[PDB]
Subunit: 458 residues, 3 copies
Amino acid sequence: MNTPKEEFQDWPIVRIAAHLPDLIVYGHFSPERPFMDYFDGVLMFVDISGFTAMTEKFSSAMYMDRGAEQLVEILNYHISAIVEKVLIFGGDILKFAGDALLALWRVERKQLKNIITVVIKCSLEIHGLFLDIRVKIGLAAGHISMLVFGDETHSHFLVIGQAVDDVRLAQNMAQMNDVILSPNCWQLCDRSMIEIESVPDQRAVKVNFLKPPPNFNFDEFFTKCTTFMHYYPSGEHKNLLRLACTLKPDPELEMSLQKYVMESILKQIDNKQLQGYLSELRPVTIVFVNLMFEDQDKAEEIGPAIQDAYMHITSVLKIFQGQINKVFMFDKGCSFLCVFGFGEKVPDELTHALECAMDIFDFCSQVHKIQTVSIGVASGIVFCGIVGHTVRHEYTVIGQKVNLAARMMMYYPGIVTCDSVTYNGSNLPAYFFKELPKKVMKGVADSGPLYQYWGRTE
Amino acid sequence: MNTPKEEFQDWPIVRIAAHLPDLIVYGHFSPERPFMDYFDGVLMFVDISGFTAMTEKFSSAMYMDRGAEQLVEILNYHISAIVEKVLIFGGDILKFAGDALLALWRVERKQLKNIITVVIKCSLEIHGLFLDIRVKIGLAAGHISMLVFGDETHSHFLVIGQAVDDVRLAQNMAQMNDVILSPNCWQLCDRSMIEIESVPDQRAVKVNFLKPPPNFNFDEFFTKCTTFMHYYPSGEHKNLLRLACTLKPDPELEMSLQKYVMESILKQIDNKQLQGYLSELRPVTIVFVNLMFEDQDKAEEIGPAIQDAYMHITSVLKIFQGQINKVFMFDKGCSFLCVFGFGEKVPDELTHALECAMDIFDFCSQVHKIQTVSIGVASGIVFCGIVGHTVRHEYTVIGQKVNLAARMMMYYPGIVTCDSVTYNGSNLPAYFFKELPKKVMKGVADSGPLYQYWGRTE
Amino acid sequence: MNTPKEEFQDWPIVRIAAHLPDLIVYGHFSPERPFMDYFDGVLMFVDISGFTAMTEKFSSAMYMDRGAEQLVEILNYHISAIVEKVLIFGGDILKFAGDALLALWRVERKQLKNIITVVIKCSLEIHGLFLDIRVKIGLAAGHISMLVFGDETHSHFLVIGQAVDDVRLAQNMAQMNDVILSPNCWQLCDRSMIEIESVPDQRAVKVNFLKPPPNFNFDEFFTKCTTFMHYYPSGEHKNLLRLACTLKPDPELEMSLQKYVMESILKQIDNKQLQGYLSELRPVTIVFVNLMFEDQDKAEEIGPAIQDAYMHITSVLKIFQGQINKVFMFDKGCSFLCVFGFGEKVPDELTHALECAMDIFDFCSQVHKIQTVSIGVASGIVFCGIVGHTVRHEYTVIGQKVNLAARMMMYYPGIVTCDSVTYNGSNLPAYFFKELPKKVMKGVADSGPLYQYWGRTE
Ligand SMILES: Nc1ncnc2c1ncn2[C@@H]1O[C@H](COP(=O)(O)OP(=O)(O)OP(=O)(O)O)[C@@H](O)[C@H]1O
Ligand SMILES: Nc1ncnc2c1ncn2[C@@H]1O[C@H](COP(=O)(O)OP(=O)(O)OP(=O)(O)O)[C@@H](O)[C@H]1O
Ligand SMILES: Nc1ncnc2c1ncn2[C@@H]1O[C@H](COP(=O)(O)OP(=O)(O)OP(=O)(O)O)[C@@H](O)[C@H]1O
Ligand code: NA
Ligand code: NA
Ligand code: NA
């Protein structure tokens, strides 16, 4: 009787699960919203510095209208290699945001110290790897909360809390090529093996090297650590990067997981649209919404506020034809990265983006526990596409206007701002705006004039 | 000198042969029509009970317009596993009809007894495997005839005879989860190994278990049986589910095989249309045509009659824009499962379906050796797509209206009937119909009012 | 720590490199135009005789509108097998032209003799392999020059010189199934091992067999020869047909290589169009342009002339909507195989083809060092598609009109000619043409009337 080879089965549910972390794929939690859970772990935020500049260059004539194709290829070649190290070292990639990603090693509190060594080692191999591209890495460890918010057809998750704030702060300090530990990570780690230098005006520290003791064998130490890793591929499946590669059809699980993934991606998953059409350099409008709270580490406070704000944001995006591309905590606040055009006639798309932004601003300002709303609106050519590895990848955007909109909303809090492309392009009369003082902004060479969107009445 | 790996070659001819059994792929018989051949073998009819109800449910809002995608995924996951057992145990899958299939072990008469043991063992492993889904299995054995009918561009085949009637009868008796043997199968089998219980008002029997004797080794017994299996993958190709996976381009063979496969499937095979678009839940009209004969086990009588009727059916389907989806023998008659919309404006599609049905009814009623024509017309949302395994799969339909149309044509013989969706929707005046008595029908909870299509004149 | 399998990565750059030889992929030469380089090697020109006739037949009704699909399948099945032998024996396939190809073993001068034995052995295995299809093979050896010409967005290469003329001459002598050596190849080869017969009125010779001496082991001899093969897959990559399968993203290299490949192919590479649509039997107009030089073996003379002519050809093809499909040296001249329709309204496409041909004729006639321009214009159904192996394939055309246009331009030099389909179809008045004497042409049974395109004025 033959025992013929069974082919890898690339079911829709498996393709869907490439877009999500094990935290959701295997999570099985309540479908109620907001939902909150609490755990501990180590976080790694990995940033490839330089793709934003490359993005601009790939619009140039030398790329012969294949810029988006070339950009995504060279980006995924590099990011793929990082994704593989993360996964082989046992991490769960939570999200991609442009040319960066955030990973988690969720473990019981006693195991944090050892896993910190695993993550440090991972970081240093990543730092080793391989355009003018640098990698910066921030690490944090401690208490983490997860929030899941949404409606009956869409779900979104976030991690929240001091370790999440720390991992942002750490990454923002890294010089090109640093690996930075949050103060708490440094406090919890195996200091006898981890050799650091100090950081100016900071309690965070920079890793110089690992100095294992005489009897230390990394392979055996890792093996012990894998006792605590619920989904580490093993035994018959030890040749796989993710357990989620073995998921089987299950209509209930697929119904739940598809709610996290945008419809145009589901269309490609279902082989109803060609792959190529989602990788593009297209003119869009970014609307970057920031919500600040009295206490942004307290899920049970902020969770309902985020859900409330989400319910309105989504109804208003539907009307003005925008989408939520990504949601994450900044150091300061919960941020919604929304996109218009991914389109109407262009004075109209611009105008809608602005009216949508004002409406979200007015509504969210009144939501209980939201301290401040800030929104930045910027327009230009940005890269849109699927970034990552075959087994773990996400739709995302990269571009100078994405970063500019983020910087605006942070440096001009409490108001709606827009750049001159948006100002000049909109259908709206000039006295709906106020020309603003030029601020010097981290990461930004020249914004051109910035404006506040004051709105219809005085 | 390198000996580099030669990749699997997924030539068009191999993709075509996934849609057909070895009985045709390797058959090489005359292109004349009707063509008839005679042999012996064992038949297995496997039915997954429950997908028809799931189909209805997958239209519901919770599936978020991905019902067809989810339906086909969960269906193929299960059916694939059945297909693999059939093939590993040496069977040839002849056809898929919705969530059921029919398989054949063609062998010389002396080998029937032993192969019956193979098929029984296969059935019991299938029954073992793994929604509210049950599998029922009927088995028959004996003389089988094959008919091939068609025109210069299209070919269709059928198996005919007492073993084919028996396998239908057997399957219809199975309770959820039974494996039933036809009387003749029971008569021919190795009764010393096969432990059965009786079936009420029936000579067919139900299998309880295998009870092999002391010296029996299934692996060695199977190996002996494979001497008689012309196309069992072996030697260099023992890791393949089908020999047809190794077929090589051959324009003559491809010309002959493509005639069995519908044009929209050939378009997908040739990479001229996206895969996804053939899996759909779409409103269609089913026209289920049943031809009854004086003697439906006699190929040389019925073969010309079927060909004659086919020639007219196909010319009329062309005019009214329908297609033949599947042809099979019922216990009572040869049945053509035709589909409209897989479309025109809807009072028109409905009207055409009805006029086409009357025309086929009038013509076929006069074909020599056709005793009765019955036709059921039902309209609604049905699943359309490719069902099966990668190596063996077919386009088919599943839905409550498909089954209702089959039940109508059987419970209201000698006339054309339609359901109320078709009645109410058609462009035709009411006195073209007669409202019928409500019959209680096996498998059907509520038809709603049924009608006879009386036609234009009184 | 797992070491999971890394999948083959089918990056865009790798897909691009399937369309090009190692001579370009690994060439890294100046982007200036013309560019010329000089080397030595052995050439093999392999022609599958008979596909041109099959092409016509595959338009017939028996192929049921799947002629193009069936043609490309049966062609690639055969050509693939030839490509694999070439590559395993260490050759670099330079180009495909219809059902023929040209391969190169570039080596230092001392190694020519031994490599000639490798190529002969390759030829004889190819000749062994496997419709009414015959293979003919011509071999040459000696000095070869390479020219790269083009503009800022498009690049084309050619090989030039006496060994290139010889390999054309050799192939044209081969009887169905011969392997022919150029005089110089015969002169340079290991005559003690190579058993030949003479060719009438020719110094070229025909191979009968290899007669290795007593101690000769082909495997060990080949192994020695591979010392001189820069890109022979080896060590970890010895299971690969080409080193180019391991190419990594590199935006600069991709920018350079994509310039050789047509835009519609890049669109398919980038998954923005279905594969199937490039394989077709479509009515086109072939414009076959031949440029003759005083000395066609002298790259430094002809290189600038070709570049000059290219610059004008391409600007005129843009205006009249044609494309350059392939460029090669004939025995007599540099030939540009251009195609219109791969379309406008048909009296217009025909008319444009003709006006484009006259314009190219007028311009190129005045280019310094171009002795004669001849152009043949023929219209009909021709096969268009990607021919070759997965790892090495090219877009090309095959058909009786392609060959007729080539024969016209050779048998009617110094003028523009067209066939009667083009004549009768064009929008142009009859006195723009001259009816020509019927010449008997090698390869052509019946042209129908031929015409010179005299042009607008007398
Ligand atoms: N989806 C996204 N794609 C791209 N950028 C984003 C995205 N989401 C947020 N950003 C913002 O872009 C900024 C990038 O940080 P920074 O300006 O220091 O550049 P970088 O990360 O070193 O270089 P590059 O921008 O080339 O990656 C972050 O502050 C972040 O808030
Ligand atoms: N291509 C087809 N797709 C679906 N049903 C079909 C098809 N062809 C025929 N049928 C009819 O549907 C009927 C199914 O049998 P029955 O009503 O007992 O339901 P079942 O098979 O147990 O459950 P389910 O209908 O969910 O599979 C058969 O009588 C058969 O004649
Ligand atoms: N891209 C091309 N596709 C098809 N034919 C071409 C192409 N380019 C040139 N040709 C011409 O077609 C001719 C083929 O040679 P010939 O007429 O002797 O037929 P053959 O090669 O034996 O048979 P077949 O034409 O069936 O392959 C060559 O002279 C060549 O110049
Ligand atoms: Na970044
Ligand atoms: Na069924
Ligand atoms: Na040829």
